[PDB]
Amino acid sequence: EWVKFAKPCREGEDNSKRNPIAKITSDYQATQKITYRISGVGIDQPPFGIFVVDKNTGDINITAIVDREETPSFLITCRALNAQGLDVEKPLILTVKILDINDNPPVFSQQIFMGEIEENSASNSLVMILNATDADEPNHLNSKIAFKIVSQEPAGTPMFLLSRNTGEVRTLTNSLDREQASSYRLVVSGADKDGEGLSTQCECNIKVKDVNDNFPMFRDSQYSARIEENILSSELLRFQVTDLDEEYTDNWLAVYFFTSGNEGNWFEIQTDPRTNEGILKVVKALDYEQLQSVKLSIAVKNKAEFHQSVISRYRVQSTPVTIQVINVREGIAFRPASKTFTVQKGISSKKLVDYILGTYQAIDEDTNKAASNVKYVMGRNDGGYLMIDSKTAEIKFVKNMNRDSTFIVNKTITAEVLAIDEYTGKTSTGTVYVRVPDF
């Protein structure tokens, strides 16, 4: 049976006065003489010259300064040899624990940590988990690292905290605001002995991500334009809009839409992706004598839906827009560009004479009523079937029978009608189709 005993030893200190550091004995030494041998680190394994044993007594002396960071403890393998040199006991394992000194500073893995976190996030939300390490004894004050946000260059109102010991950087409040501070540059101070010892520092950069928490609103309370009739445009106006969110993102890209007035789809809006502006297009021309004043209402949205932090606050704008439609001197023309008459079936193609086919009169476009002061006349009257009254624009027949080629085509026959203004000679044309069931 062995009898073990061992002292601790201080790192870096000269323990040459505490010798013997340990003493091992086998009770067999009473009945017979036994010699002691030892092995292991400090002796056979590197480093060497740290431990020696008194072969006769068992007093184990320490012989060199120790570094516990290199050798946190020592496992000495002792043996009790017979007078003839044979073993007499199972090799015991004598442990010498080495006491720690605070001779290693805490150190961050990275000299610059980086993280990202959304905007308006809940308090105590996690950003990043910066790390550090201390080579001194684990679960001991000398390795207990303590972190501290010391400076926040971005502003003067605090937005971050970190766990004293775990080093978790956390959101200090729901008031993270990208369009108040797009990014934060912290600086951390990790220190051992819980904070009142050695220390090193590191830097932290936090990119505050963007969300749609700002509503795009027009830079004006009202818009107005001035365009003539019978004209299309790619740009009548340009609506401006401000959006506080990160630019060139869907959280900032405006999307306009008509809330009213565009009952007839005369207008369309295209958003200028470069300037966010809204281009007011006229895709269908407007007649002055039909509507000389169109009032519209528009509203803006982002291409992205709004965040949960402001979703409820959203209501429509409905900004007034009024386009002045200006009049131009238009002339007389056939309102329908072509009329379709249908001669009855009760007639035979050999007795169509004096069949008043109907009236087909052009109209003044400065009004919308009967064109006054004109002369009505036939044009390309192929076959010579139709004749028009030069005042009432009534159309009679003046030919019967059915010649096949040219005259009659697909049950129909076609002629032009000219309306000449008494004060221009601006000859306006209309085309007269006349269905006929020859059978």
Ligand X SMILES: *[C@H]1O[C@H](CO)[C@@H](O)[C@H](O)[C@@H]1O
Ligand Y SMILES: *[C@@H]1O[C@H](CO)[C@@H](O)[C@H](O)[C@H]1NC(C)=O
Ligand Z SMILES: *[C@@H]1O[C@H](CO)[C@@H](O[C@@H]2O[C@H](CO)[C@@H](O)[C@H](O)[C@H]2NC(C)=O)[C@H](O)[C@H]1NC(C)=O
Count of residues that interact with ligand Y, criterion CB under 6 A: 4
Does 61 participate in binding ligand Z (rule CB under 6 A)?
yes
Residue for token pair 């002055």: 288
Under rule CB under 6 A, residue 379 binds ligand X: yes
Does 156 help bind ligand X (rule: CB under 6 A)? Answer: no
Measured CA to CA, the distance from residue 311 to residue 210 in angstroms comes to 15
Q: How far is CA 14 from CA 9, 54, 216, in A?
A: 9, 20, 75
| Residue 144 or 339 with smaller CB distance to ligand X | 339
Q: Closest residue (Cβ) to ligand Y?
A: 131
The CB density around residue 96, as the number of other CB atoms within 10 Å, is 22
Compute the half-sphere exposure of residue 181: CA atoms within 13 Å on the CB side of its CA. Answer: 19
Shortest CB 335 distance to ligand X, Å: 12
Nearer to ligand Z, 79 or 144 (CB): 79
As a whole number of angstroms, the distance between CA 257 and CA 270 comes to 9
Which residues in the 232-251 window bind Ca ion by CB under 5 A?
243, 245, 251
Per CB under 6 A, 427 contacts ligand X: yes
Near ligand X by CB under 6 A: residue from 221, 315, 337, 404: 337
Size of the site for ligand Z (CB under 6 A): 5
**Residue 30 has which token pair?**
């009473």
Q: Kind of pairing, strands 107-108 and 25-26? A: unpaired
Q: Which of 21, 22, 23, 134 lies at the binding interface for Ca ion (CB under 5 A)?
A: 134
Tokens of 306: 């709004």
Q: Whose Cβ is closer to ligand X: residue 239's or residue 334's? A: 334
Asked if 402 contacts 408 with a C-beta cutoff of 8 angstroms, the reply is: yes
Q: Which is nearer to ligand X, 300 or 432 (CB)?
A: 432
Beta bridge partners of 61: 52
Q: Rank residues 47 and 384 by Cβ distance to ligand X and give the closer one.
A: 384
Build a one-symbol-per-residue string for 99-128: x at contacts with Ca ion by CB under 5 A, - elsewhere: -xxxxx------------------------
Number of residues lying near ligand X (CB under 6 A): 11
User: Do the Cβ atoms of 301 and 216 come closer than 8 Å?
Assistant: yes
| 213 touches Ca ion (CB under 5 A) | yes
| DSSP β-bridge partners for residue 388 | 395
- Please classify residue 31 by burial: count the beta carbons closer than 10 Å to its beta carbon, then call 0-12 exposed, 13-18 middle and 19+ buried: exposed
Judged by CB under 6 A, which of 7, 35, 37, 54 binds ligand Z? 54
Contact 399, 386 (CB under 8 A): no
Determine contact, residues 150/189, Cβ cutoff 8 Å.
Answer: yes
**Of residues 32, 109, 124, 292, which one binds ligand Y by CB under 6 A?**
109
With CB under 5 to 8 Å by kind, the binding choice for 100 among Ca ion, ligand Z, ligand Y, none is: Ca ion
Which of 6, 52, 92, 294 contacts ligand Z by CB under 6 A?
52
Per-residue binding string, ligand Y, 68-107, x by CB under 6 A, is: ----------------------------------------
Tell me which of ligand Z, Ca ion, ligand X, none is bound by residue 52, counting a contact when its beta carbon lies within the kind-specific cut-off of 5 to 8 angstroms: ligand Z
Residues 137-156 that bind Ca ion (CB under 5 A): 142
| Contact string (CB under 6 A) for ligand Z, positions 346-385, x = contact | ----------------------------------------
Name the β-bridge partners of 161.
Answer: 170
User: Cα–Cα distance between 200 and 366 in angstroms, integer?
Assistant: 87
- Does residue 20 touch ligand Z according to CB under 6 A? yes
Residue holding tokens 């827009």?
A: 321
DSSP 195-257: GTS-EEEEEEEEEE-----S--EESSS-EEEEEETT--EEEEEEE-EE--SPTTSTTT-EEEE
- Shortest separation between residue 367's beta carbon and Ca ion, angstroms: 9
* 3-state helix, strand and coil shares in percent for the chain, rounded to the nearest 5: 5, 40, 55
Q: Which of 102, 125, 131, 431 binds ligand Y (CB under 6 A)?
A: 131
Interface residue with ligand X among 188, 420, 434, 436 (CB under 6 A) is: 420
Contacting residue, 111, 133, 151, 373, with ligand Y by CB under 6 A:
133
Question: What is the secondary structure of 292-337 as a DSSP string?
Answer: SEEEEEEEEEESSPPPTTTGGG-----EEEEEEEE-----EE-SSS
Could you tell me if 294 and 322 are in contact, meaning their C-beta atoms sit under 8 angstroms apart?
yes
DSSP class of 193: G
Q: Residue 283: which of 272, 269, 297 has the closest Cα?
A: 269
| Beta carbon of residue 19, minimum distance to ligand Z (angstroms, whole number) | 4
Contact residues toward ligand Y (CB under 6 A) are 109, 129, 131, 133
Contact residues toward ligand X (CB under 6 A) are 337-338, 379, 416, 418, 420, 425, 427, 429-431
